[PDB]
Design a protein around this ligand. Sequence first.
Ligand code: HEM
Ligand SMILES: [Ca+2]
Ligand SMILES: [Ca+2]
Length: 332
Amino acid sequence: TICADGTSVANGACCKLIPVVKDLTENLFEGECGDAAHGALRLVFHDAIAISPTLGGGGADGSIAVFNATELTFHANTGIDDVLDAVGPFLLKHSDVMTPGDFIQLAGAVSLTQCNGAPRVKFVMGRPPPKAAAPNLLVPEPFDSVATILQRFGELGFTKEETVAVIGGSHSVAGADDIVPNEQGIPFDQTPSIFDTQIFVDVQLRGTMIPGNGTTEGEVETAVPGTVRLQSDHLLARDASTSCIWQSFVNQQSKMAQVFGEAIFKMSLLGQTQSKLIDCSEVIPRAIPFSHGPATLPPGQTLKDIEQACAASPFPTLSTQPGPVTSVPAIP
Ligand code: HEM
Ligand SMILES: [Ca+2]
Ligand SMILES: [Ca+2]
């Protein structure tokens, strides 16, 4: 079917989503891989992962928006109130054509296309409205152990490879608003507007510093001024179950993107039955091709500053970016 805009879709029910995509790209994200895009991506996880085989929760069901009055009382959802302040008006204005679970997955898929190197993910619609708030304690916290993290993701059907890709990859285009005391927009990697593998390098370095005037539980030292490091990422890069996976993504942007895209799509289906959904992948914007060079070590860092954790292979011999140590700019 040809939509009013000229887009051909396999299922004509998808045509009603085209204005939603345009609104998100023009008016929420403003064509940028910035604060709004980051929020929409994070919302995908906080909505979808909140499901357990034994404790309940509906997964990718829109509960985090509909039942925000409950789910925003959960510690793991710190900062989601601010995300919903930005995204929530768009969810409401487009609630005539799609359910909230569908909207959240759409917005995350569209967010990625705003970012250099991020994959164009598949997208399906047809998730029913949510029945209830997720239980508490289903969203992983940055102070959770690797074993805890792998149990949560693994029990939901993710491989370890997918788990590392989807966490690390997301943190390549991300910052913290609630970790560095009284500071917002503090990136996890040197390039929060680029979907590159700098996050993988940055986290493998020995940490030497904390930003700001104190820590929050689940934060550890970072190696690069103007960034922050989560304990969870720190441990995932160093634990024997995940460290070879973590290292495998360094300077492998295409591989990382492909795995990430597969993982996001899997995440999008949590709590759903793929049978009763409709493919609407044609509505997702074109991806922005990765246009940056190889991964590098940050200025002033050398291979002796890498904490080797993968026993199978040495850390790739990357170049060091030229020039003086500089503080990474905060995300506007
Ligand atoms: C063990 C798993 C994970 C943990 C513990 C974790 C933890 C965090 C924390 C603590 C923050 C900063 C939040 C704030 O300061 O308010 C954050 C930001 C973010 N996370 Fe993760 N995360 C995980 C997995 C993921 C996944 C799977 C995705 C995407 C599907 C994701 C996407 C993001 C994004 C995009 C941001 C930045 C938000 C912004 O700049 O507004 N995270 N994460
Ligand atoms: Ca949910
Ligand atoms: Ca990056």
